[PDB]
Amino acid sequence: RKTVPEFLAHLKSLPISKIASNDVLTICVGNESADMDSIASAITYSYCQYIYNEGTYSEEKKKGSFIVPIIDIPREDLSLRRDVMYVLEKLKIKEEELFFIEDLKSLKQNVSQGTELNSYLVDNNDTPKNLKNYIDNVVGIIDHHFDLQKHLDAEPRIVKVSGSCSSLVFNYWYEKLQGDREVVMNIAPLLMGAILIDTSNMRRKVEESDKLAIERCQAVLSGAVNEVSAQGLEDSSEFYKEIKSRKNDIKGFSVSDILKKDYKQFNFQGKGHKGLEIGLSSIVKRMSWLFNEHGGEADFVNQCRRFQAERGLDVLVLLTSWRKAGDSHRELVILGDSNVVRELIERVSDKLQLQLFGGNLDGGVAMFKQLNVEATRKQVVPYLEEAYSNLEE
Ligand SMILES: [Mg+2]
C-alpha cells in the first residue's frame, strides 16, 4: 500500500483515461482560499478513497475510480503558505506531485471531449466560483462552514460544526477503513497540521469531531504502551509552533501577495437586481506593521486599491488578527464607494464593536479596531450580507 506521496506520484504517472472511468473524471477540491484545512482535507479524501477501493473493506461493494485532489490556486501561489509548505516537506510531498488550477485545466483539456468532470467538495459546500465552468456535477460534500443548502443529494453530505474540516474527513474515512493503523500513520502529519492550526493546538474552536480525530491519531502514534508519556503531546506542541510561526510569517511578501493568500470573494444580493461584489482578505499582522513593511500607509492603501480594481470589487475588506501578551486583537479596514461602505459599517459597528482609528467612511476608506475579537471572517460575512439587504435600491 502506497504512502501519500507515492499515491500522488502514481496519479501523476497514469494516463488520464486510467484516472477517469466510463467517461467520468472525478476530483476533490477545497475552497478558493487553499489554506491548510482545504489542502489537507482534499488530499486525505482522495488518498483514503484509493486505499478503501483497493482493499477488503470494499469487498462485495466494488467500483470506485481514482479521485484527483485539487488545490484551488495557481501553482506559484503555494509558496505564500509557508505553513503548508512546511507540512508538505515533512511528509515528503513534492509540489510536482500536486494538482493546482493549471493541472485541473490540463486535465479538462486532455480528457476525451465527452467526459464529465465531477467533484467532491471539502471545506466548502458549493463549487468555488472560479471552477464553475470546469465542474459538471457535485457528487459529495464534507464541510464545516455555513450550509448554503445546495446539492442536497450529495453523497456523502456532511456539513457540521468542527474546528477543522480535516477532522470530519478523517473520522468519516476512519470508520470506512475500520481504523486502519497504516492509513492513520500515513496521513496523521497532514491531518494534524490542519487540526492543530485550526484549533490553536486544541485550545479554541474545539468540537467533538476534533477531539475524536486527535484521540484516534494518539492511539495509533503511541501504539502498544504500558504508560502514556508526555512525549506525544510535546511533539504535537513543537509541530504546532513550527506551523503557526510559518502561518504568521508574511515578511518579504508583496501587498498583492498578502491580500490574495487568504482571500474569499462573494456577490451579495440586495434590493437592487445588481449585487455587491465584495472581497475579504484575512491577514495575520496589524495595519501598523503592514504600513511599515510596505512604504507607509499611503503606499499600502494604493496597493489595496489596485488589488480591488484588478478583482473587479465594489468593496474590499481586510480583517487582521494577532496575539500579543496573551491578548487577541482584530482590525477591519474597508475600501469602496463612500455611500455603500458608510451604510455597511454603520449597520455592523455595534455588533463588531468597531472604533475608528483611520480614514473616514465618507471617503470610502476607513480603518477600525474591532473589539469583538470572537468574530472572524465567518461571522463578518453574514453581518455584512444582512446589512447590505437593508440598503435601499
Ligand atoms: Mg476549514
365-370/354-360 β-pairing? antiparallel
The domain total for the chain is 2
Q: 292 and 351 share a domain? A: yes
Q: 133 and 280 share a domain? A: no
Q: 173 and 318 share a domain? A: no
Q: How far is the CA of 54 from the centre of ligand 1 (A)?
A: 28
Q: How far is the CA of 121 from the centre of ligand 1 (A)?
A: 12
145 a known binding residue? yes
Q: 227 and 255 share a domain? A: no
Place of cell 480528457: 111
d(CA 5, CA 170) in angstroms, rounded, equals: 18
Edge to edge, the sheet with strand 263-268 lists 263-268, 276-283, 315-324, 327-336, 365-370, 354-360
- Written as nine digits, the cell of 85 is 509548505
**Residue 106 half-sphere exposure, CB side, CA atoms within 13 Å?**
12
Q: How far apart are the first and last CA of the chain?
A: 60
Domain's final residue, options 217, 248, 279: 248
Q: How far is the CA of 164 from the centre of ligand 1 (A)?
A: 5
Cα 149–Cα 151–Cα 156 angle in degrees, nearest 5: 105
- Written as nine digits, the cell of 20 is 477517469
Q: How far is the CA of 143 from the centre of ligand 1 (A)?
A: 7
Q: 118 and 265 share a domain? A: no
d(CA 46, CA 26) in angstroms, rounded, equals: 10
**Residue 172 half-sphere exposure, CB side, CA atoms within 13 Å?**
24
Q: 153 and 257 share a domain? A: no
Q: How far is the CA of 33 from the centre of ligand 1 (A)?
A: 10
Measured CA to CA in angstroms, residue 103 lies from 12, 30, 72, 253, 339 at distances of 10, 15, 10, 25, 42
Q: How many residues does the chain have?
A: 393
* Interhelix angle 165-176/181-198, nearest 10 degrees: 170
- Residue 304, domain CATH: 3.10.310.20
CB-based contacts of 159, cutoff 8 Å, min separation 6: 125, 141, 142, 143, 144, 145, 147
116-122/137-143 β-pairing? parallel
Expt. technique: X-ray
CB-based contacts of 179, cutoff 8 Å, min separation 6: 216
CB 29 within 8 A of CB 43: no
72 a known binding residue? no
Q: Which domain holds residue 188?
A: 1-248
CB 14 within 8 A of CB 50: no
List the one residue out of 205, 225, 213 whose CA is nearest residue 179: 213
d(CA 139, CA 159) in angstroms, rounded, equals: 14
d(CA 313, CA 329) in angstroms, rounded, equals: 27
Per-residue 3-state assignment (H helix, E strand, C coil) for the chain = CCCHHHHHHHHHHCCHHHHCECCEEEEEECCCCCCHHHHHHHHHHHHHHHHHHHCCCCCCCCCCCCCEEECCCCHHHHHHCHHHHHHHHHCCCCHHHCCCHHHHHHHHHHCCCCCEEEEEEECCCCCCHHHCCCCCEEEEEEECCCCCCCCCCCCCEEECCCCCHHHHHHHHHHHHCCCCHHHHHHHHHHHHHHHHHHCCCCCCCCCHHHHHHHHHHHHHHHCCCCCCCCHHHHHHHHHHHHHHHHHCCCCCCCHHHHHHCCEEEEEECCCCCCCEEEEEEEECCCHHHHHHHCCCHHHHHHHHHHHHHHCCCCEEEEEEEEEECCEEEEEEEEEECHHHHHHHHHHHHHHHCEEEEEEEHHHCEEEEEECCCCCCHHHHHHHHHHHHHCCCC
Q: 189 and 275 share a domain? A: no
Q: How far is the CA of 18 from the centre of ligand 1 (A)?
A: 31
Q: How far is the CA of 362 from the centre of ligand 1 (A)?
A: 35
Q: How far is the CA of 309 from the centre of ligand 1 (A)?
A: 28
329 a known binding residue? no
Q: What was the resolution (in A) of this experimentally determined structure?
A: 1.9
- Written as nine digits, the cell of 64 is 470506485
Q: How far is the CA of 43 from the centre of ligand 1 (A)?
A: 14
- Written as nine digits, the cell of 165 is 474540516
Q: How far is the CA of 231 from the centre of ligand 1 (A)?
A: 28
144 a known binding residue? yes
Residue type for 227, please?
A: E
Q: How far is the CA of 325 from the centre of ligand 1 (A)?
A: 27
Domain's final residue, options 205, 222, 248: 248
- Written as nine digits, the cell of 337 is 464607494
Place of cell 508526555: 230
Q: How far is the CA of 302 from the centre of ligand 1 (A)?
A: 31
- Residue 12, judged by CB atoms within 10 A of its CB (0-12, 13-18, 19+), counts as middle
Q: 189 and 48 share a domain? A: yes
Q: How far is the CA of 66 from the centre of ligand 1 (A)?
A: 23
Domain's final residue, options 214, 248, 282: 248
- Residue 90, domain CATH: 3.90.1640.10
Q: 14 and 128 share a domain? A: yes
Q: 121 and 224 share a domain? A: yes
Q: 176 and 312 share a domain? A: no
Q: 167 and 295 share a domain? A: no
Q: How far is the CA of 278 from the centre of ligand 1 (A)?
A: 21
